Amino acid sequence: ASIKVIGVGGGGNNAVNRMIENEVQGVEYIAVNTDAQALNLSKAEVKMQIGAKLTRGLGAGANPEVGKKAAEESKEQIEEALKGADMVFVTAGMGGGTGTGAAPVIAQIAKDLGALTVGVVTRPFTFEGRKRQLQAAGGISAMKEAVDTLIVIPNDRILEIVDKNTPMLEAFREADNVLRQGVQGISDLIATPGLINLDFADVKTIMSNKGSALMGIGIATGENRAAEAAKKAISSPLLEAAIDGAQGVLMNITGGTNLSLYEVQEAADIVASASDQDVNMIFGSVINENLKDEIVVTVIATGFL
Numbered sequence: 001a002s003i004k005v006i007g008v009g010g011g012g013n014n015a016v017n018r019m020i021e022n023e024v025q026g027v028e029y030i031a032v033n034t035d036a037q038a039l040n041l042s043k044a045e046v047k048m049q050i051g052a053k054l055t056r057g058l059g060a061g062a063n064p065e066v067g068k069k070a071a072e073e074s075k076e077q078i079e080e081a082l083k084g085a086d087m088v089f090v091t092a093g094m095g096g097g098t099g100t101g102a103a104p105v106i107a108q109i110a111k112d113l114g115a116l117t118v119g120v121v122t123r124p125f126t127f128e129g130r131k132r133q134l135q136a137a138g139g140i141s142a143m144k145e146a147v148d149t150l151i152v153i154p155n156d157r158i159l160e161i162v163d164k165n166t167p168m169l170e171a172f173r174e175a176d177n178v179l180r181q182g183v184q185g186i187s188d189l190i191a192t193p194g195l196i197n198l199d200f201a202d203v204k205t206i207m208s209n210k211g212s213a214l215m216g217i218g219i220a221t222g223e224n225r226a227a228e229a230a231k232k233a234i235s236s237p238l239l240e241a242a243i244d245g246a247q248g249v250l251m252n253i254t255g256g257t258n259l260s261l262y263e264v265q266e267a268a269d270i271v272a273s274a275s276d277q278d279v280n281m282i283f284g285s286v287i288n289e290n291l292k293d294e295i296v297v298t299v300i301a302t303g304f305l
């Protein structure tokens, strides 16, 4: 009932902006940064500047230790801001300073308060270099000590989904959108009950990550749109391990007012059949008027090990 999405650092705050622009519902947004100037560019209702003393608003200089210590200075304000949450999503681009460093501390504060804590983060594009990958690897492992499940999106695989010619700015804009899909794919099912009923317990069921959780997405229009979206999702480059390996699968089928009963059963079957015969599968369905001929299938896969 109280669901918070907390964007952490530049990339995380940009994802939260995307979510706000797509008018994702049922969540309260918090933006967090060590850089006061970038924080001023956030559309989140709540704008939290961490490490005022340590950084004087000037950011974390790509250093995870400064992000970590900024969040420790601001420990009590983060506690305050997260008070009363049943569920907390922590999004960030891993590899920089504020995200890598502060997102785990924020995740752990969420968890200590009793919130169901899901992380949705990206691993950096190879083209950002070896130093970024290494800092990201470090933050990813810290993060999964601090959350109930960590969805890790490998940015390289986005290049296999967007066109050959894509400058950086645009590549990073599609990373905002995959982050948004990871959060929304879950939150949409929980914010409002749904025609398929789906409570917190259903979600806690699959919310058990040792191992990085992975996500697949599939979009389609036309007359076989259901099977084509389902198939694309279980086939997404973002899903770096076959879905048949996962202990847990959450499926979200989203469409417009003409999403059909037969399509929901079709997609549910395609995804279930590609999965292990002993899988714990929970799924839901949501209507989004803004979609017309388009359906979106999202699969979140957990418990690979």
Ligand SMILES: Nc1nc2c(ncn2[C@@H]2O[C@H](COP(=O)(O)OP(=O)(O)O)[C@@H](O)[C@H]2O)c(=O)[nH]1
Pocket: 008, 009, 010, 011, 012, 014, 015, 060, 062, 092, 093, 094, 095, 096, 097, 098, 099, 100, 122, 123, 124, 125, 128, 132, 155, 172, 173, 175, 176, 179
């Ligand atoms: N989703 C998204 N990711 C970004 C963006 N810019 C950079 N990144 C990624 O996020 C990582 C950290 O960047 P940034 O968030 O600016 O660092 P931070 O503010 O110190 O946490 C980078 O290594 C990139 O892979 C962006 O605008 N959107």
